[PDB]
């Protein structure tokens, strides 16, 4: 069902992460950390004090698809094991920790109908890495997903 879904997405916050590889993006689901510039870092950090859940919704650069979208569970920390981040090392910020919801494709053809309003209400697959995705718009693009039956959202809900 969609049931828990929708109530991890009550009132998130939502924003586009772009990768330049997809061997991070893989780095990122089998391990639950993610790391971004500075300036993003402080955005995230703010918006995981404002919100029940903040989502980073993943995009490849060049792949025209979502690679899938997880959860917040931790401000940025530094210090933990090296991440062996595949570089297009220091002027990345700290580490968060990440709670996939759904690790399943979504190619940019499904979202067409979707504009943000916080990026000029361009089709929500333009923006760069941080931009933030309003509610309703990040809402709707996170149901397009197909659903990923290998994840359990009640240890998710349960962090809330």
Not at 27 to 41: D, F, M, Q, R
Not at 51 to 70: M, T, W
């Given at each position: 069902?969609?049931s ?26 089998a ?6 510039l ?5 955005k ?7 919100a ?13 698809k979502?690679?899938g979208?997880a ?9 933990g ?17 990440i ?8 190619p ?22 941080g931009?933030?995705?309003?509610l ?25």
């Amino acid at each position: 069902g969609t049931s828990k879904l929708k109530y991890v997405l009550q009132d998130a916050r939502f924003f586009l992460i772009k990768s330049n590889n997809h061997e991070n993006v893989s780095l990122a689901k089998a391990k639950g950390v993610w790391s971004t510039l500075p300036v993003n870092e402080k955005k995230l950090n703010l918006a995981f004090r404002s919100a029940r859940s903040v989502i980073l919704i993943f995009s490849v650069r060049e792949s025209g698809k979502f690679q899938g979208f997880a959860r917040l569970s931790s401000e940025s920390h530094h210090g933990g094991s090296p991440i062996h981040w595949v570089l297009p090392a220091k002027m990345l910020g700290g580490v968060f920790k990440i709670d996939w919801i759904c690790r399943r494709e979504l190619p940019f053809t499904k979202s067409a109908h979707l504009t943000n309003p916080w990026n000029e209400h361009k089709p929500v697959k333009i923006g760069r890495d941080g931009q933030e995705i309003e509610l309703e718009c990040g809402t709707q693009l996170c149901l397009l997903f197909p659903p990923d039956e290998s994840i359990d959202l009640y240890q998710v809900i349960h962090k809330m």
